């Protein structure tokens, strides 16, 4: 998952 800018 990427719950925030972490890969987004």
Q: How was this structure determined?
A: NMR
Structure token digits, residue 6 = 């972490």
Pairwise CA distance, residues 1 & 8, whole Å: 10
Residue 6 backbone dihedrals phi, psi, to 5 degrees: -55, -30
**Letter string b/e over residues 1-8, b meaning 16 or more CB atoms within 10 A of that residue's CB:** eeeeeeee
């Amino acid at each position: 998952x990427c719950y925030x800018k972490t890969c987004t």
